[PDB]
Amino acid sequence: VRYEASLRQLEQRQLAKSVISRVQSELGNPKFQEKVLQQSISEIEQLLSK
Amino acid sequence: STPITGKVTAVIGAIVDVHFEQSELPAILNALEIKTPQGKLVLEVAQHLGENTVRTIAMDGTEGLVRGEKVLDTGGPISVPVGRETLGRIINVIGEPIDERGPIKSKLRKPIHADPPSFAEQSTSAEILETGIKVVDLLAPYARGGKIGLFGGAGVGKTVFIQELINNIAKAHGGFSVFTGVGERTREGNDLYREMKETGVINLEGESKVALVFGQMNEPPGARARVALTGLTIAEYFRDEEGQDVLLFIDNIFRFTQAGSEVSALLGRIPSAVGYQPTLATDMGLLQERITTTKKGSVTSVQAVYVPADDLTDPAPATTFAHLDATTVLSRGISELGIYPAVDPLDSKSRLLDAAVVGQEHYDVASKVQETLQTYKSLQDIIAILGMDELSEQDKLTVERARKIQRFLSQPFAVAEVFTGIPGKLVRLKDTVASFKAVLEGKYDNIPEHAFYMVGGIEDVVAKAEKLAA
Amino acid sequence: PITGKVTAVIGAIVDVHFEQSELPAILNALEIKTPQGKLVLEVAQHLGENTVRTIAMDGTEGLVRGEKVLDTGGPISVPVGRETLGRIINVIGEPIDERGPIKSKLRKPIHAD
Amino acid sequence: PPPVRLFGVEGTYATALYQAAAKNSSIDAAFQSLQKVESTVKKNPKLGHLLLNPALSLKDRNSVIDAIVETHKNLDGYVVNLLKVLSENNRLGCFEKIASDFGVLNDAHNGLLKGTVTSAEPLDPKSFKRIEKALSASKLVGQGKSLKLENVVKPEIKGGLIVELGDKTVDLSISTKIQKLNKVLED
Amino acid sequence: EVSSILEERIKGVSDEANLNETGRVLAVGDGIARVFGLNNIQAEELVEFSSGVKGMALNLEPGQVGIVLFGSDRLVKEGELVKRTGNIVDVPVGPGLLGRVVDALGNPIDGKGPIDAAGRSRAQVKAPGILPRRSVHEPVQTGLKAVDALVPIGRGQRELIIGDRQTGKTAVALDTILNQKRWNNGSDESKKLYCVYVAVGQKRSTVAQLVQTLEQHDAMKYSIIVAATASEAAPLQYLAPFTAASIGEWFRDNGKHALIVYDDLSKQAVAYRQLSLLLRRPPGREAYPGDVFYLHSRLLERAAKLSEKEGSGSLTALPVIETQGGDVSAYIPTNVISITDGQIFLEAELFYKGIRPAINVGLSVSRVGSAAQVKALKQVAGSLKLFLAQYREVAAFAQSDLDASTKQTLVRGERLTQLLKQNQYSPLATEEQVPLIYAGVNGHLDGIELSRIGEFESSFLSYLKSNHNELLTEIREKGELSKELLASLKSATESFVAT
Amino acid sequence: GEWFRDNGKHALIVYDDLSKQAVAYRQLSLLLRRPPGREAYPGDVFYLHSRLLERAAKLSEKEGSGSLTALPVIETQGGDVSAYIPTNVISITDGQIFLEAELFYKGIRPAINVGLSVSRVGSAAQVKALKQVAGSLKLFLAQYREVAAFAQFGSDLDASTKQTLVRGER
Amino acid sequence: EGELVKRTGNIVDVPVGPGLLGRVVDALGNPIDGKGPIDAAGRSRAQVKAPGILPRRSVHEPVQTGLKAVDALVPIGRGQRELII
Amino acid sequence: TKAQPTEVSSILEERIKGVSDEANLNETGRVLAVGDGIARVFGLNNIQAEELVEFSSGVKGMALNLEPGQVGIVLFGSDRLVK
């Protein structure tokens, strides 16, 4: 019963390291170029709104 | 190797400053390893002094260090290995075996610092340990998941008391235990290794029902500070992951305070009150708060404390005095009177002592015992100057009962087969309440005082009455 | 008009940096306009380099290092007269008896020989 | 009278220099020559490393100064008095510190801001222009003091960018957001 | 599920560091980040780091502002941006905190969710003036017989609770709270004292025992526990009573009454010591900060009985100081003793001697005392002070051949002492305090055997409850003991005493 | 000493007086401007003394029997072990052999303060014969101490106390 | 002042050996009683770490001081550490 | 690098400005930081040890610590008049 409850909690931490793997994918992809360009233009927009 | 290469800049003892280069700067509490002909010097990062120059505390020895020496970053608080097989290993401060049973089999590794668990996690204790030791059982019963505290000075064989506890509570208990020795003697280390190899608590064939972490006083002060944290995490693995109940044991926690005081001074933090570290409170707090009865496991710490010159008003014992659940003071004087246990009964109280909680009957009996003893101690002064002639018949009866009770408490222990030869008297709590009740009722006030001395329960007291009789 | 900017607020020990040839004297009284009304600082040192070190009389909360200061030019001058008979006045010399504003004709320095 | 107090530690030197050369209005000349002698001193690393080393005496420092005034044929005698001062004060290690600080005071007097568009990667000139337009347009920098922006590449910022100047930053680094994301998905 | 957590992160989007001032750590050691930047920064402003750590800015040094971290060192590392929250320390205040265990920041550690608090008001706020206070005239009843008569406690009043370590110091406090449930149940907000227990440096396990006991005694529904636990950081611990006071101010300001128990200021002192030492500010006498007097006094003067133009309200307070083995001389005790108006001094010998809870009323004093006391209780308790006084003197004449007068005193005194024993975690009502004391006063308990004092007490109460519940109701409602009521009461006492 | 210990031979090292070692390290620390601990003795003196002292050992008998035995000597200045150097040493050692000056004058020279002479670790090294005989020597003396205090008030003493008193005196 | 120092390059070490038996020696291991020239048996280094738990065996070898009170009341064995205070 | 009593900004400002003291300030001083009833004065280099100095406050003082960059007079009198 104890590990049965535990596995539900553990699963989220298992899924956490998979986000990290997906992070390695994002920063490798030309999401690294294109979404950084998106951040740049968005930041331009934020700074323009000041 | 690591881009995070640092060059030593100043060896000022334990304080060793390292000069990490640009764009690389280990976070506070990291662990640096420096390749040396002394293995890996482990440095605990404790400050950044800016310009990518950190100030770290050494754990291991600092002799033979050459400035500008490349420093690899292992990062984060020193991570030991934890696992099912850690039981039956004696483990040094840096998490490496010191019983030459080869490398500890790592299931998981964890950092030695771990965050205290939140209010939500805490579960309210109520379980009552029964040590089978009369003074403990009657006059200050222990509780499972507790934070028992063995305040005493030196000389009271603090380790000996714990050894009795391991023999009784540990052997009886099904859960594992962790014996942690902070800054203790290699004489004691060798004795403990031998003693628990003998008692089979350490059973080298198969596993042991205990793990050991011997940190000794020759180890440099930095290591002395951070041995406690290490031991705690091993217990956490049992508590959490293996879902066990752990009987933690630590020895002697004054060494933990003392160690921290030294490296506070070395860190340049000007010594606070009575030369104790300004971070004494928070360091104590971190240790105690980490220990708790989580839903995954109940951990019962027993922490030895050395009370310098029997002044517990000294800030280091006094600060600890608040932080611990079930205090006992083992007074030298009472030991000298020949009463073993050396516990001073009017100076030994536990949180679990609440009337109905420990049994209304138990409480009332113990209250009567306490009053009887307290009267006796006060009346000793009257006897001293005035004489025993000014004590009434009622007072005299209370005194006679107290003298009998005082030595009824005296009972032998298994670990003073070694000291003496008498085999210990494991007297159950229920039996003790009854046995003490009988005395108060005066049913065995027809038994000589010395036939109460250094013996077990009421049945035994009657038997020793027969022994003196013939 | 002697003016200075607050250049430290370590505790209630407030160091004020005053502009050139506008240096106070030891025991002078400074008044910093605050959203607390005023804060009265008394110059108890010269830290040199056109800076002084002063002590505070009123609270320290909300100080921003920069705050303009006006220097009265000497020890706090507290109202005096038979008008001051029966007036509870706090240290700055202002009613805490709340019998309205000061009615006293003259005010006089707190330090004297 | 410094534009902004860059209190002490070579900025006491910078302050002193600034007002002294401000009253002679020979700050550009001073700065340029100071920069020039420093550049060629750094590019004379024989005593551009040993300049830093504090082995030098009063007397040995004095002979270093003599070599230095061969290296630059004058330009502001207050910085030649600065050389004397530094040798006498027996520290020349932070020499460039004074120069940098003096540069800040000088170009503050001129009214120039120097910002940075730190990013993971080097950025587009279009981006530079857009940010420059945005900054001048914003009431935050309504000019009166110019804009220089230096895009720098720092891999440490793992995605996103951070614009910095005037203690006003716009930080859209993805790395920080990622840290909080990782943390929140532990349950 | 996984979705809710991810959606929470998505809710957590919004970015731009557009802040007039940011900071950059220069070096961070000892939890004292020294930041370059933050040119504009209010004094003791809350600042939020890159690591989300919160801090206060005790030292504003000319070139660098030495932030003090409320969070863990490990996360922080040099250079990191330090966003400026722009708000001096303030904590939510409002009616939501009733039956809520909150930590220093206000975050519920009992997880009863976001506070229903209607404002955030600063941690330190200047104390009520001369005219914002009216003289005390409303007593509070702790349900401890000795305290209520021997050491009468008003409302908006601060009396010390200075005594020996872990002798159930917290227990002495908790008993008062229990009697406040009875009054709490009653109407009129003056009678509704919304108690606040300020658990300072207390481990979460200990506070868990408190929380459950409070829940058991249903106290949570007016109780507030401001918690700065042992684990909680030294800034949080330092600001914990100050923060707590502000919560009290909301109730007080609304004209209501409440009781705030600061437990224990001794550990607060240690935290301030830790802060001072780490900020290198010289530590005062006995290595405890010099202006600790100023801090503690400021805190303790924010407890007061406000004037009627200030809405007739109060914040009663009961600070707890832990003696260093009964040392009442020591810089922190001496200072606090000076600040406080009243003291309660628990005596260890008495604890051992079975007066549990133990109070020594010789060393308890009230400097406001009987000015606020139940009128009924005044009538039947002048004698008691004097009787006990004599009992103290003839205590040491109790060691053979004794004069009848002394022996008579001794008998009356011993019975009284037994009567004044308190059974922990059982409070009492004034309408039942007065009969018991009346009996003793009339010396009708002189005859009652010592062993039977205990038995007598409860029996007398039941006898009164069945037979003379008219008397009890009269005592309760009149609040004064009429001669006719005292006549009848004496008769009742005699009748019960006879059996 | 280690050459003997290593060689498998038994030896004894008397360290008289370590208290002056502390003064020396104090001088060094204060002239190397490293923060000075309590009583101005260095802020790492415990480490110095502890590392020094634990070297003495009854070597493992897989590695032979050479035992260096140590006797530290801390000459208490006033007699007050709350002093930093005395506190430190007390923790380090397996036993303490408190001596009393008054008892020296009283004629128990060598003077042993037997009340404060303790061995935390306790006894097991001492001749078996001598162990048998001195079994109740401790009890007699302890009783003598209590009895002697009572005796000097000149208060009436029962014969049992005077058996103790007489025995104790001898 | 301004003097040159040439690094010896050797960590602190002492001549050790049973050759010092019956002789007084100073710190640098030169006989200050001047009983012959240095007789020893090797050199060793000043700091040497203590024998471990495994390199320890239990003490069971008495050693007696000849003072009855000392022998009786405090135990002295070969490997013991006893503080004379 | 480090802080010295000759790195004081007013002193420093004269030196950079190539101002020659001219021994005027080797026999006259100008007061610097003041308070704690002792003042640190710049110059007075021809001062005799334990001389009496006269301030412009009128207060007189005895030079105690003659230091290379400052001389530390001790004020025989109130600091109120001194600046």
Q: How many Å lie between the alpha carbon of C98 and the closest alpha carbon of chain H?
A: 34
- Classify each residue of E177-200 as buried b or exposed e, where b means 16 or more C-beta atoms within 10 Å of its C-beta: bbbbbebbeeeeebbbbbbbbbbb
Q: Of B42, B77, B112, which residue constitutes the final position of a domain?
A: B77
The answer to whether the Cβ–Cβ distance between E16 and D181 falls below 8 Å is no
- Closest Cβ–Cβ partner in E41, E129, E130 for C64: E41
Q: Which of A44, A46, A49 to mutate to test the interface with D (most CBs of D within 10 A)?
A: A44
The answer to whether the Cβ–Cβ distance between G56 and B187 falls below 8 Å is yes
How deeply is C64 buried, as exposed, middle or buried, from its count of CB atoms within 10 A (0-12, 13-18, 19+)? Answer: middle
User: Which ranges in B32-181 belong to alpha helices (H)?
Assistant: 134-139, 158-165, 171-172
Q: In terms of Cα–Cα distance, which of A17, A2, B238 is closest to D186?
A: A17
Chains in contact with C via at least 3 Cβ–Cβ pairs below 8 Å: E, H
Q: How many Å lie between the alpha carbon of E313 and the closest alpha carbon of chain B?
A: 33
Distance CA C109, CA C26 (A): 14
Q: How many Å lie between the alpha carbon of E18 and the closest alpha carbon of chain C?
A: 20
Could you write out the three-class secondary structure of chain F?
Answer: CHHHHHCCCCEEEEECCCHHHHHHHHHHHHCCCCCECHHHCECCHHHHHHHHHCCCCEECCCCCCCEEEEEEECCCCCCCCCCHHHHHHHHHCCEEECCCHHHHHHCCCCCCCCCCCECCCCCCCCCHHHHHHCCCHHHHHHHHHHHHHHHCCCCCCCHHHHHHHHHHHC
Cis omega (within 30 of 0) for bond into B26: no
Distance CA E43, CA B251 (A): 45
Chain C residues closer than 8 Å to H34 by CB = 26, 45-46, 48
Q: In terms of Cα–Cα distance, which of C24, C25, C26 is closest to C3?
A: C24
Q: Please tell me whether residues B22 and B89 are part of one structural domain.
A: no
Distance CA F161, CA G3 (A): 77
Tell how far CA E261 is from the center of its chain: 1
The domain in which residue B20 lies consists of 2-77
Q: Of B327, B352, B377, which residue constitutes the final position of a domain?
A: B352
The answer to whether the Cβ–Cβ distance between B419 and F54 falls below 8 Å is no
Q: Please tell me whether residues B106 and B249 are part of one structural domain.
A: yes
Q: Coil, helix or strand for G84?
A: strand
| Chain B, window 245-264: residues with a beta carbon less than 8 angstroms from a chain E beta carbon | none
Which residue in chain B has the smallest CA separation from G50? B218
Catalytic (active-site) positions of F:
120
How deeply is E135 buried, as exposed, middle or buried, from its count of CB atoms within 10 A (0-12, 13-18, 19+)? Answer: exposed
Q: Please tell me whether residues B60 and B176 are part of one structural domain.
A: no
Distance CA D176, CA C80 (A): 63
Please report, in range form, the residues annotated as the binding site of B.
Answer: 152-159
Q: E231 — contact with chain B (CB < 8 Å)?
A: yes
Q: How many Å lie between the alpha carbon of C21 and the closest alpha carbon of chain H?
A: 12
H58, HSE (Cβ side, Cα atoms, 13 Å): 3
Residue B169 DSSP one-character state: I
| Chain B, window 354-383: residues with a beta carbon less than 8 angstroms from a chain E beta carbon | 367, 370-371, 374, 382
Which residues partner with F97 through β-bridges?
G84
E343, HSE (Cβ side, Cα atoms, 13 Å): 21
Q: Coil, helix or strand for B200?
A: coil
Distance CA E232, CA E71 (A): 9
Which residues partner with E120 through β-bridges?
E92
Please report, in range form, the residues annotated as the binding site of E for ATP.
Answer: 163-170
N- to C-terminal Cα separation, chain A: 56
Q: B336 — contact with chain F (CB < 8 Å)?
A: yes
Please report, in range form, the residues annotated as the binding site of B for ATP.
Answer: 152-159
Chains in contact with D via at least 3 Cβ–Cβ pairs below 8 Å: A, B, E, H
Which residue in chain F has the smallest CA separation from B258? F46
E21, HSE (Cβ side, Cα atoms, 13 Å): 17
- Judge contact between E227 and E207, C-beta under 8 A: yes
Q: Please tell me whether residues B82 and B65 are part of one structural domain.
A: no
Cis omega (within 30 of 0) for bond into F17: yes
How deeply is F67 buried, as exposed, middle or buried, from its count of CB atoms within 10 A (0-12, 13-18, 19+)? Answer: buried
Q: What CA–CA distances, in Å, run from H8 to D21, D92, E377, H3?
A: 18, 17, 73, 8
Distance CA B350, CA B146 (A): 10
Catalytic (active-site) positions of E:
367
- Closest Cβ–Cβ partner in E59, E124, E291 for C10: E59
The answer to whether the Cβ–Cβ distance between H83 and C27 falls below 8 Å is no
Which residue in chain F has the smallest CA separation from G43? F3
Both tokens of E135, joined, read 């003289």
The answer to whether the Cβ–Cβ distance between C48 and H82 falls below 8 Å is no
Distance CA B17, CA B55 (A): 4
Q: Counting every residue, how long is chain A?
A: 50
Q: B65 — contact with chain G (CB < 8 Å)?
A: no
Which residues partner with B185 through β-bridges?
none
User: Which uninterrupted H or E stretch holds B62?
Assistant: none
Chain D residues closer than 8 Å to E16 by CB = 170-172
DSSP string, B384-398: HHT-GGGS-HHHHHH
B touches H, CB cut-off 8 Å, minimum 3 pairs = no
- Closest Cβ–Cβ partner in B158, B185, B265 for F35: B265
Q: How many Å lie between the alpha carbon of F164 and the closest alpha carbon of chain G?
A: 19
H touches A, CB cut-off 8 Å, minimum 3 pairs = no
Q: How many Å lie between the alpha carbon of D170 and the closest alpha carbon of chain B?
A: 21
- Domain made up of H21-83: CATH architecture: Beta Barrel (2.40)
Taking the domain E15-87, which CATH number applies? 2.40.30.20
Chain D residues closer than 8 Å to B22 by CB = none
Distance CA E223, CA E213 (A): 12
> Could you state, in order of their start, the residue ranges of all structural domains in chain H?
21-83
Q: Which residue has the tokens 């404002």?
A: E119
Q: Which residue has the tokens 């932070």?
A: D94
Q: Which of D61, D81, D83, D92 to mutate to test the interface with H (most CBs of H within 10 A)?
A: D81
Chain E residues closer than 8 Å to C8 by CB = 60-62
Strands C77-80 and E54-60 turn out to be unpaired
Cis omega (within 30 of 0) for bond into B341: yes
Strands D168-173 and E320-323 turn out to be unpaired
Distance CA E249, CA E255 (A): 9
Domain E88-373 has CATH 3.30.70.2740: no
Catalytic (active-site) positions of B:
158, 184-185
The answer to whether the Cβ–Cβ distance between B271 and F43 falls below 8 Å is yes
Q: F44 — contact with chain B (CB < 8 Å)?
A: yes
- Closest Cβ–Cβ partner in H1, H2, H16 for D16: H16
The answer to whether the Cβ–Cβ distance between A43 and E2 falls below 8 Å is no
- Closest Cβ–Cβ partner in G11, G49, G58 for B190: G58
Pick the CATH number of D11-110 from 2.40.50.140, 1.10.520.20, 3.40.30.120, 3.30.70.1230: 1.10.520.20
**Letter for the amino acid at E462?**
S
Q: Please tell me whether residues B376 and B463 are part of one structural domain.
A: yes
Give me the total of CB pairs closer than 8 Å, taking one residue from chain A and one from chain E: 8
Which residue in chain F has the smallest CA separation from G46? F52
Please report, in range form, the residues annotated as the binding site of E.
Answer: 163-170
Q: B119 — contact with chain E (CB < 8 Å)?
A: yes
The answer to whether the Cβ–Cβ distance between F67 and G59 falls below 8 Å is yes
Residue G79 DSSP one-character state: T
Cβ neighbours for A21, distance < 8 A, ≥ 6 positions apart: none
Task: Report the interhelical angle of H9-16 vs D78-88 (nearest 10°).
Answer: 130
E touches B, CB cut-off 8 Å, minimum 3 pairs = yes
Q: In terms of Cα–Cα distance, which of B78, B94, B96 is closest to B86?
A: B96
A touches F, CB cut-off 8 Å, minimum 3 pairs = no
CATH assignment at residue B17: 2.40.10.170
- Classify each residue of E243-273 as buried b or exposed e, where b means 16 or more C-beta atoms within 10 Å of its C-beta: bbbbbbbbbbbeebbbbbbbbbbbbbbbbbb
Q: How many Å lie between the alpha carbon of A45 and the closest alpha carbon of chain D?
A: 8
CATH topology of domain E374-499: Lysin (1.20.150)
The answer to whether the Cβ–Cβ distance between B189 and G11 falls below 8 Å is no
Q: How many Å lie between the alpha carbon of D43 and the closest alpha carbon of chain E?
A: 30
- Closest Cβ–Cβ partner in E9, E21, E63 for D181: E9
Both tokens of B3, joined, read 């881009």
- Classify each residue of C86-97 as buried b or exposed e, where b means 16 or more C-beta atoms within 10 Å of its C-beta: ebebeebbeeee
Both tokens of E304, joined, read 């007061």
Both tokens of E93, joined, read 């205040």
Chain D residues closer than 8 Å to H4 by CB = 89
